[PDB]
Amino acid sequence: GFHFQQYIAMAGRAINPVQWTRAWRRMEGKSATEVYRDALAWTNNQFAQISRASQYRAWWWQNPLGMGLVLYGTYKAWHMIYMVRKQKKTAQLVAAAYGQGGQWLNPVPR
Amino acid sequence: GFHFQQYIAMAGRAINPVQWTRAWRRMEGKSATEVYRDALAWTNNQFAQISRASQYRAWWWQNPLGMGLVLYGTYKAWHMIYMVRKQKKTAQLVAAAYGQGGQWLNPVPR
């Protein structure tokens, strides 16, 4: 893993509406195949930078588990940011519709 | 800041009862002045290592705020570990003795 700060900056630019007009202008004379190939090439460049530079270089986060800890932290961040938020919303939904624990209720006795 | 792992290891040794017997044996023919001077010298050696090595060396945690962030993190760790624990206990105490918020109740009206 690397360039997390650059990734945050990329997301900020993407959410900026001025950049939406800039992308609208850049999309003139452009194809979906070209866009997809560009994105795939970017991702490959990132992973290839990792595969090459891990052989000789160590980041500030280097640890006896290596990049495994960074990838676990990425996963945990994603989980807590997205999935637990969705769980909160689903909890409030179920509690308003059936009551707390309403989705695990037993069938009506016959 | 530096050698946090060594400090954790020191605490572990201190809490070990075998080391209590070892210290009992080491205290033979020893003075309180000597012990105090030894501890003070150890602390001075730590802070002097910092003052010297910060001039030319950078740790893995180096950041645009320097050691200020490490010291803040030390403080926050101490706070959350000790003071908030004490607050929890005091909260349960007050809730059992007067009720929740019992220490901020108004005086009895005359």
Partner: peptide
């Protein structure tokens, strides 16, 4: 990226807890 170099030396590295300073 490709591993360039004319060297046959199998070289690995160990890391420290200090950062590179220029």
């Amino acid at each position: 990226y490709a591993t360039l170099g004319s060297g046959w030396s199998f070289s690995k590295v160990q890391y420290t807890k200090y950062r590179i300073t220029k």
